[PDB]
Amino acid sequence: MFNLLKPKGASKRRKIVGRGPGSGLGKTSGRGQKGQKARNTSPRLGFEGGQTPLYRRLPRKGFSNSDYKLEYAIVNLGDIDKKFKDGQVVNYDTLLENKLIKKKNKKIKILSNGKLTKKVSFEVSKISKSAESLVIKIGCTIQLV
Amino acid sequence: MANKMKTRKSAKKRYSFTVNGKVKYKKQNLRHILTKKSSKRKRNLRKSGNLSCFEVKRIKTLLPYG
Amino acid sequence: MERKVFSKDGKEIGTINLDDRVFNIEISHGSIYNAIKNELSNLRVGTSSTKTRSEVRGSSKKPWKQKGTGRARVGTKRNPVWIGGGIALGPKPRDYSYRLPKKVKKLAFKSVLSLRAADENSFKVIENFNVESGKTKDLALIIKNFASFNGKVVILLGNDDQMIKRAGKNIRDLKILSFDKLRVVDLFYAKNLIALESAVNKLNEFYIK
Amino acid sequence: ARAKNGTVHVARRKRILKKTKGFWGTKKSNYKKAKDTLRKGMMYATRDRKVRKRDFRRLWISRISAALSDTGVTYSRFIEGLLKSNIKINRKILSNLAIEDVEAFKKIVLEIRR
RNA sequence: UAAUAGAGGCGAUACCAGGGGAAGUGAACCAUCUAAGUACCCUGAGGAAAAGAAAUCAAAGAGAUUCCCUUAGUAGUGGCGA
RNA sequence: GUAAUUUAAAUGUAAAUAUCUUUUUAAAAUGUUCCUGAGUAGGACGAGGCACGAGAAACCUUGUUUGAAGCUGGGGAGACCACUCUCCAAGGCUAAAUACUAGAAAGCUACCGAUAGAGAAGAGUACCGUGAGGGAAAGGUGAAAAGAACCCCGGGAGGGGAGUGAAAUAGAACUGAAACCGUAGACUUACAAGCAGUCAAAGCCGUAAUUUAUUGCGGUGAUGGCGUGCCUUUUGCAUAAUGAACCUGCGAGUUAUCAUGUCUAGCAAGAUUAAAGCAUAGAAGUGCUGGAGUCGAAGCGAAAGCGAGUCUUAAAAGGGCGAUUU
RNA sequence: ACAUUACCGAAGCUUUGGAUCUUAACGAAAGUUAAGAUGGUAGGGGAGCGUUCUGUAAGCCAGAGAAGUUAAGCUGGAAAG
């Protein structure tokens, strides 16, 4: 005897249905009276009862351009300030080991949320104009790779 | 993986999701006979719109992943 | 925390330190509960089965005409309603195993160890020994010198001492566990818990990390 | 994991049959008829528990009216004088009084007629 | 005609390869499509079979074939309807 | 019997060692010639397979036709052209990883316990149909037959005695209910129109108290008042709408995955491993190893692209979608 | 028909005893008071009884009598025990 003492609310019971009048889920079991829905079914296809559905009244807009996206990771100046220090090269290797990106992507971009105060060296693939202005102003260096 | 819910492609090609819930879409009636339609009507039909909040739940069911 | 160490004859020999970060964590009864559930669910085979309408032997011929006979309509003889027929919504083989997050499992281990060590009498520590003969008399003598609560006894080891393990595989209410292969259910329900100081040290660096 | 043990239905039926002991014909032994008759009986029991108050008050009124038939006081006037002279005795009490001890009730009536 | 050698059929109401190939449905009809190479039929052997050592993948620098986890419900296709 | 060990004359299946069999009895080394897979590559028309339905429709197989080059070559790089990068067909084999268990042996189960479980604890038998084919129901004495010697009634069966046995309301069967059929005792009923019940209530009977015939536990109940069985379906049913002979068993929102919401547990700008491997054990575990991938961390625009801004536009000029307050 | 004084008459109202919930107050809290609020199908939310197996359980209770029907009595607001 040690009485595991489960935390409360850790397991709802169930919605056992069709098991008597007193349970509130009696003969009809939550389905209503009759019709299509009383017997397992509902016409799925976003159906509006034969009215032309919304996704068929509206028109389309174009391709998705996948298979040709240049997808790659965003890193912000506030993040660099919070995580790094002076003199090292913010690049693929250091951001990867410091866990700012994952080594699936290798084309990082640097954005300008938060503020950066530390002189650093950068070896990145793209940079926003606002961010490089702020970074040159603080006195860092920028090589585009 | 045996039973991944399939998206509704014909709906994907027409609906888009904004960051906090709303659904973006392209307005109708600007595809076809256009000479008779007034210029301000056509200009309003060009700009994209947002759907009423009443369809968002059904659309979220139609696009289980997007 | 500090703890007295008894010799293998029941008498005190020395003292040992139980690290607080393992044996004095605040108890997480929620993690203990989740871990116990998981350890006992992973132990199910879950191979029970049953036959539907389609797997009971028999033909799918309509037993009699739809209209005119005077009997209740029926489609096949192995109708779930009919006696001997299939079984609607019965049990089918299924996988009951699942894996808890490792952090939760670790926290449960720390919690159960702290909960057991909180009590001075039921938890005890014995200086390293071994049963070089492999017999069972010697081991049983050691337990029956220590254990008092007439019930489950769990011995903790700091290695894989095959002699002790195969000497204790036959004791009545005994469970031998190495430090790195713990089981929360055995720890939680053990009424006597006897650890070696080798096991104590290996547990300290095992769960401090 | 089969969960069959049918020590439940016999229990329900035994309790029902225990409560339906003296009923006529097949209503005392058969499960279906006993349950139907019992369930309508319990509803009758509730209704009648509320009706017993009306029935007994009606009886008391009739008894009072009978005990007053002698004198010349119609008991509407008797209730009248009773309230007007501020005697807050009860219909049950007066009805029982007219039987146990008639002269006390008669004295009350003489006193009302004022 | 002679000589040896290998086969006939059964078994597995399983698996594999080759050939033939629906219909009930969904699309609240249906004719495209779907179901589906599904059921089933037939021809072959094996203990696995088939396939298997690039006139290939594919824009990455890899390196036979097959089976998993992911990529991914993605890329495309579809009376762009399902 | 089980743990840990261990029987092989003979037979079958496995490797290893020689025997045996076969092969090289040689390679690093420059340019001229020969060959390097022919109705084949490809093209036209008609089809199929590729996720890809003629669509811009590659490529492969392929029916009807046509038809090449020979490394100074040819094929492919999703119409095609050029360049470039790869590869060298039209000859034939290949174990392992992988699919499957009718079965054999050794084991396990929050699998079943006789309407369950294979149809079948006795079997595709009995039975039905010309045949193809379809297809049941029936488990239990006692610890041991130690099966009731003998006697009485009876033609027997069977029962009553005597014996065996802890028990014979254990005698061809354990526990033996309900539906159904009875016996005996108590009470009520043959002037009365009762969904059979409930609320009141005299008398009779059983029983406990209070010194004892008046109050309770009770069973029956003359008489009074009230009361249109139930289920399902309908605007609406006692309805002469539907359904049930009764009773006892059996007999319906489950499982596997995805989406999303909430609760619980844990971590946190991060969270988390999947397949799979190792170790111990034989204990379909659980402790590690394994980060490939996914969801957040920036969105906007058809896209290019730009980014706390972006798009619509010469315009932040106004708005649309964002955010600085996660 | 027109006047005077009445009475009877519903689960309405009032009073008595008891229970739950909402709000407010008091109280460390538990709870104690005040106010009102609880007919109800579809349907939504919440709280429990009971059955079988598993861990607890190599525990506890049984031949001095388990399980099961079976007579009577008793408890709980209902499932029931």
Curated annotation (Swiss-Prot), chain A:
Task: State if Ribonucleoprotein is listed as a keyword.
Answer: yes
Q: Name one GO molecular function term.
A: rRNA binding
| Keywords, alphabetical | Ribonucleoprotein, Ribosomal protein, RNA-binding, rRNA-binding
List where Gly residues composition bias occurs.
19-33
InterPro entries from the xrefs? Ribosomal_uL15, Ribosomal_uL15/eL18, Ribosomal_uL15/eL18_sf, Ribosomal_uL15_bac-type, Ribosomal_uL15_CS
- In the UniProt record, the signal sequence range is none
- Any one GO BP annotation for this protein: translation
Instruction: State the superkingdom.
Output: Bacteria
Q: What GO CC annotations are associated with the protein?
A: cytosolic large ribosomal subunit
Region (Disordered): which ranges?
1-52
State the Gene3D superfamilies in the record: 3.100.10.10
- One Pfam entry for this protein is Ribosomal_L27A
Q: What does this protein do?
A: Binds to the 23S rRNA.
Oligomeric and partner information: Part of the 50S ribosomal subunit.
Family listed: Belongs to the universal ribosomal protein uL15 family.
* Name the UniProt record assigns to this protein: Large ribosomal subunit protein uL15
**Origin organism lineage:** Bacteria, Pseudomonadati, Spirochaetota, Spirochaetia, Spirochaetales
Q: Which gene encodes it?
A: rplO
From Swiss-Prot, chain B:
What processes does the entry annotate via GO biological process terms?
translation
SUPFAM superfamilies given for it?
A: L35p-like
Identify the Gene3D superfamilies for this entry. 4.10.410.60
User: Can you quote a single GO CC term?
Assistant: cytosolic large ribosomal subunit
Which is an annotated GO molecular function term of this record?
structural constituent of ribosome
Keyword terms, alphabetized: Ribonucleoprotein, Ribosomal protein
> Which InterPro entries would you find in this protein's record?
Ribosomal_bL35, Ribosomal_bL35-like, Ribosomal_bL35_CS, Ribosomal_bL35_sf
Q: Which family does it belong to?
A: Belongs to the bacterial ribosomal protein bL35 family.
Record-given protein name: Large ribosomal subunit protein bL35
Q: Can you name the source organism?
A: Borreliella burgdorferi (strain ATCC 35210 / DSM 4680 / CIP 102532 / B31)
From Swiss-Prot, chain C:
**Alphabetic keyword roster:** Ribonucleoprotein, Ribosomal protein, RNA-binding, rRNA-binding
**BP GO terms, sorted:** translation
Q: Which domain of life is it from?
A: Bacteria
Specify residue ranges for compositional bias: Basic residues.
Answer: 59-72
InterPro entries noted in UniProt: Ribosomal_uL4, Ribosomal_uL4-like, Ribosomal_uL4_dom_sf
Q: Where is this region: Disordered?
A: 46-72
- Molecular function, one GO term: structural constituent of ribosome
Q: Which Gene Ontology terms of cellular component type are present?
A: ribonucleoprotein complex; ribosome
User: Family per UniProt?
Assistant: Belongs to the universal ribosomal protein uL4 family.
**Role this protein plays:** One of the primary rRNA binding proteins, this protein initially binds near the 5'-end of the 23S rRNA. It is important during the early stages of 50S assembly. It makes multiple contacts with different domains of the 23S rRNA in the assembled 50S subunit and ribosome.
Please give the NCBIfam families that the UniProt record associates with this protein.
Answer: rplD_bact
State how it assembles.
Answer: Part of the 50S ribosomal subunit.
Spell out the protein name for this chain: Large ribosomal subunit protein uL4
Q: Which organism is it from?
A: Borreliella burgdorferi (strain ATCC 35210 / DSM 4680 / CIP 102532 / B31)
Swiss-Prot record, chain D:
| Keyword Ribonucleoprotein annotated | yes
PROSITE patterns registered for this protein in UniProt: RIBOSOMAL_L20
Q: Which InterPro entries match?
A: Ribosomal_bL20, RIBOSOMAL_L20_CS, Ribosomal_protein_bL20_C
> Which Gene Ontology BP annotations are present?
ribosomal large subunit assembly; translation
Question: Keyword set for this entry?
Answer: Ribonucleoprotein, Ribosomal protein, RNA-binding, rRNA-binding
Recorded hits in Pfam families, A to Z, give: Ribosomal_L20 (PF00453)
A single GO molecular function term of this UniProt record: rRNA binding
UniProt GO cellular component terms: ribonucleoprotein complex; ribosome
State the protein's purpose: Binds directly to 23S ribosomal RNA and is necessary for the in vitro assembly process of the 50S ribosomal subunit. It is not involved in the protein synthesizing functions of that subunit.
Family from the record = Belongs to the bacterial ribosomal protein bL20 family.
Q: What is this protein called?
A: Large ribosomal subunit protein bL20
Q: Which organism is it from?
A: Borreliella burgdorferi (strain ATCC 35210 / DSM 4680 / CIP 102532 / B31) (Borrelia burgdorferi)
The upper taxonomy is: Bacteria, Pseudomonadati, Spirochaetota, Spirochaetia, Spirochaetales
